[PDB]
Amino acid sequence: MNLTELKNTPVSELITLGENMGLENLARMRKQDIIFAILKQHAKSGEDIFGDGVLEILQDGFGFLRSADSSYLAGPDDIYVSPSQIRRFNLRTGDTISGKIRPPKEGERYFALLKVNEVNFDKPENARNKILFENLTPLHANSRLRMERDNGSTEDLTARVLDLASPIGRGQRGLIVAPPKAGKTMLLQNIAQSIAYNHPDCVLMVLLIDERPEEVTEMQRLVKGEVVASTFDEPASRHVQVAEMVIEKAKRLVEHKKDVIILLDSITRLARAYNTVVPASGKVLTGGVDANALHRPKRFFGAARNVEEGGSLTIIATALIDTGSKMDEVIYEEFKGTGNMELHLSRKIAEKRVFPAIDYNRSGTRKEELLTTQEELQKMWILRKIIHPMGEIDAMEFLINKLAMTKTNDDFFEMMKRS
Amino acid sequence: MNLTELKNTPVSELITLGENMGLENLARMRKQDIIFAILKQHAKSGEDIFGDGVLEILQDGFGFLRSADSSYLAGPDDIYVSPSQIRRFNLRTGDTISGKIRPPKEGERYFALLKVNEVNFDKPENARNKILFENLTPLHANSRLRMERDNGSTEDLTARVLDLASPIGRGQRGLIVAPPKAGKTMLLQNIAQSIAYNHPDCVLMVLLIDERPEEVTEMQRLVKGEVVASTFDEPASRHVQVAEMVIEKAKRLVEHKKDVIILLDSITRLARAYNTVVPASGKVLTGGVDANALHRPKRFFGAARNVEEGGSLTIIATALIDTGSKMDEVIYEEFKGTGNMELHLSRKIAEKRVFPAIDYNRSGTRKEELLTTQEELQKMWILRKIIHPMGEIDAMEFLINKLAMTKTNDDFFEMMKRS
Amino acid sequence: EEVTEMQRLVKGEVVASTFDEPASRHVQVAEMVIEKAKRLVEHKKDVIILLDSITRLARAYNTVVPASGKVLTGGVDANALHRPKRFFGAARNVEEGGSLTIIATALIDTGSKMDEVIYEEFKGTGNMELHLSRKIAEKRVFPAIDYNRSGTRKEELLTTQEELQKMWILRKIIHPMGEIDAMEFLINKLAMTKTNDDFFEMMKRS
Numbered sequence A, B: 001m002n003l004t005e006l007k008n009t010p011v012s013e014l015i016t017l018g019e020n021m022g023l024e025n026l027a028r029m030r031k032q033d034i035i036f037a038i039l040k041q042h043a044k045s046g047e048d049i050f051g052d053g054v055l056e057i058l059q060d061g062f063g064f065l066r067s068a069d070s071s072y073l074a075g076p077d078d079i080y081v082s083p084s085q086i087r088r089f090n091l092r093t094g095d096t097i098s099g100k101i102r103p104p105k106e107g108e109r110y111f112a113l114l115k116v117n118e119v120n121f122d123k124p125e126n127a128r129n130k131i132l133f134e135n136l137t138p139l140h141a142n143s144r145l146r147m148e149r150d151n152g153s154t155e156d157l158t159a160r161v162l163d164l165a166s167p168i169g170r171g172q173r174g175l176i177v178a179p180p181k182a183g184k185t186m187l188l189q190n191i192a193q194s195i196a197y198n199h200p201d202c203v204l205m206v207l208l209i210d211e212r213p214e215e216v217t218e219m220q221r222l223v224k225g226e227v228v229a230s231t232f233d234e235p236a237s238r239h240v241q242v243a244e245m246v247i248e249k250a251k252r253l254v255e256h257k258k259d260v261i262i263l264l265d266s267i268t269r270l271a272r273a274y275n276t277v278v279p280a281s282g283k284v285l286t287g288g289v290d291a292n293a294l295h296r297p298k299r300f301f302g303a304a305r306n307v308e309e310g311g312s313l314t315i316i317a318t319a320l321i322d323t324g325s326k327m328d329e330v331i332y333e334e335f336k337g338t339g340n341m342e343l344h345l346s347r348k349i350a351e352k353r354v355f356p357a358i359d360y361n362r363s364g365t366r367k368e369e370l371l372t373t374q375e376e377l378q379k380m381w382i383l384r385k386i387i388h389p390m391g392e393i394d395a396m397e398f399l400i401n402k403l404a405m406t407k408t409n410d411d412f413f414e415m416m417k418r419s
Numbered sequence C: 001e002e003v004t005e006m007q008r009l010v011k012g013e014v015v016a017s018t019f020d021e022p023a024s025r026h027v028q029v030a031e032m033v034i035e036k037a038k039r040l041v042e043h044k045k046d047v048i049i050l051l052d053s054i055t056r057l058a059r060a061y062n063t064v065v066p067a068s069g070k071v072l073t074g075g076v077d078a079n080a081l082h083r084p085k086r087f088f089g090a091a092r093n094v095e096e097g098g099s100l101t102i103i104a105t106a107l108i109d110t111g112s113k114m115d116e117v118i119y120e121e122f123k124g125t126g127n128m129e130l131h132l133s134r135k136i137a138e139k140r141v142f143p144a145i146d147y148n149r150s151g152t153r154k155e156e157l158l159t160t161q162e163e164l165q166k167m168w169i170l171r172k173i174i175h176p177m178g179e180i181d182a183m184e185f186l187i188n189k190l191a192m193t194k195t196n197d198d199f200f201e202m203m204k205r206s
């Protein structure tokens, strides 16, 4: 009846559903084709069919309603919307549209939208009056996103260390710097669990670029939110498309006074896709990266801000360093001081089998007075006073044993004042 | 009626204003497009429309009237001026023009200027006879800009320390040297507050290059003057454009016997933009900076001077050191002895959580006899006689406690003579 | 319709031949005008002829003149083009007195092979060249004149010593720029100047 649940159902249930409807030879076809075949057979029955998706306005004028299940990939089951709907209902890219759809008339291969009754989880009339994201005035982060989980076991202290190293708030534009094989993949998993548990209201989005297929499955099964990704086999034009879709969708949610958190991975890989797709403008910098090529990722990364009117957009990205590629290090140079939060991971700490491998001295956040209270903020200052003299390799080891014997970070603070 | 107040009004008021005029679908558009749409509807009504902006003469011959609200960014609402106006009214880049404008006729997408009745806040006839800035004879600073604020609380002693460290006067060309995360961002805020409070007559301009969007908003909300900035997402060609617009506007104000103060931030980042935009001339120095590339920032920085005929131009810039980039340190070498005032901030003082982190021994000013009185000048000499022997790390700590127990710097002077 | 507006606008006698008239009529009109023009020159009188178009005129001569057994590219006989060259070449300045000025328009890029071969024979036969660019015309900027390609030969006699050298410096700054934007540069500069003399002094200013 509704396209939303058909994609969520496994392929095995779809095969059984299609067989009783009279369809045949469905197991050997793709999942997208099965959905189209099932809808087509149900469409001619006469019962109304609903749908949902994310609008993607093309340069021609007509758009499509991509689905987050397929990672916003074009497919036969995508809903086609004529430019007339964009006229009557003023819509932009990334808008969420849910409504009745009609069977595709002969001469067209895509379903068409009949009527719109829900735009961005709101009435269509109210969505027309929402202020644009650009017109919103950015501000510093005010409310802190707690990272410590009470249910979290003492085996993994990554969540607790992040609170001591660099607190994160709504609208933060933090950047993660880490060499390869430094544990950055599961570092975001701890952040995703903490955000989902401590702040269920916040919308969590995980974006993966050039990630292995196995990595995508575990992220979807672990993160309590919608996760989109693009495998390495997909062309470069697909990687940029996924990134553009997520940021546009995130901006629309911000306009509705809603908080959305994006865990980008990785900014270095994302800039590679933009460099390839964007044609050369005649100016080539070191490493073969065009100056105009890096303009797009900066605008995407810089969109993170705290809106004074309401809502916030928090973007956390991982930067790859010491990867052996000249093109990778030059990108990190452009994104050096562009973030208000720095989280540097050390390779030499990681090889010592001590986790989390966080360089406490280098990592930090800017304007942390607003995030933390008066007492909590000054308790971190004295902690940094005793961690700075010691080496970074043993600095993490010092915190690991101290945090192990303390149930919570509050107990750790009073222990430090004891000596 | 007038374009000046439309930009100052928030977006919410613009939406309400447009709706009663018959416009529709304005919330989803940019603020610049809303202004153009509102003006277009009001233009066909018949009532006269005024305008204001800063002239930007292009290489073709025609100019535009950029607005300081949009940080001198090209937009649909910019006023177009034909070369005929530049002929009849001899105008240069950076001139402020205010006058009636006409609706755009078909075949043009920009408003046109009808008549000019105010040039540089003066009659157009008188502005034609103003002497060029280059012909003015520079001189040393004579009148000192007081930095100590009576209303200033004892919690922040940064304003008082600057008076003891290095006094600043009109036409000063001071340079600030500080490592990253040394408190330079709010250091200029204290200077901006002192200049606005002690000397409301002086025109204060704050220029930010490659600054985060959140940093821009707080500067505008705090500085009692017009503030222009360029975010990191904007291309390199935008950063140079903003810098050129400010200096040209500042020079024109000086020609009208007016004092203008520019708080540049940062000179290191500004030189990066010039290096990228300027094509290579075949000669490459250390770090990849062309010799001709650094010529433009030196001319911009060197424009600060005290005019004997009248007025002054004070430029204060922050230089980034110990940033880990080879290109950053070579730029500082060229700007080492180019400033008559030196203000060095120490990283090791900053990490001790003692502020302001100012290296008193290294910081100083040249030709301070004119700025200070006979008694005040010699009182600083004895102070430097007792601060030089002690280390720079504890030198600031010595001043902090001494200034805390003294209400004003005058009371601090007599206390030193007591012992 | 084109004939009527020319007669109502040109302050002189205008002759024309419509397309419906046979080819033998087109040659007859051309022969009558040149013969009349020559007689006026003999009486120490100046006559100016605005021919339009030389390409179309050669078509009429090619049709009426019988083939001589030799056919060039495009089907134009060598002897067929002899007559238009003599007609076009009659323009000259008479030392004894009077003059004969002939200005003709040549059609190019018309999609016809016969039209382009005719232009080849009339390439270097004129002492003045005035080339119009199609891409400038479609930009809705007029006149669409290719300044770099257009020019005249032996212009020292026509212009004065000061005026001639003022054009040389103008060509020195128009040659580097593209022909599409060269006309746009002149249009704005000439708009702000009342006369060409004021345009000359403006250029040296910068």
Ligand SMILES: Nc1ncnc2c1ncn2[C@@H]1O[C@H](COP(=O)(O)OP(=O)(O)O)[C@@H](O)[C@H]1O
Residues within 6 Å of the ligand: A156, A157, A158, A179, A180, A181, A182, A183, A184, A185, A186, A187, A355, A356
């Ligand atoms: N908090 C942690 N606790 C235990 N092991 C960790 C932790 N973080 C990382 N690791 C180790 O790192 C390895 C995975 O690293 P990975 O996340 O793939 O790095 P990268 O993403 O840079 O390739 C695992 O084998 C795991 O043992």
Ligand SMILES: Nc1ncnc2c1ncn2[C@@H]1O[C@H](COP(=O)(O)OP(=O)(O)O)[C@@H](O)[C@H]1O
Residues within 6 Å of the ligand: A366, A367, A368, A369, B156, B157, B158, B179, B180, B181, B182, B183, B184, B185, B186, B187, B355, B356
């Ligand atoms: N005068 C001051 N009083 C108190 N704290 C200060 C002062 N100056 C700087 N700071 C500290 O510096 C931090 C901000 O540094 P910032 O200005 O961002 O340095 P940078 O601009 O080099 O990054 C704040 O957390 C603040 O606590």
Ligand SMILES: [Mg+2]
Residues within 6 Å of the ligand: A184, A185
């Ligand atoms: Mg990984």
Ligand SMILES: [Mg+2]
Residues within 6 Å of the ligand: B184, B185
């Ligand atoms: Mg700063």
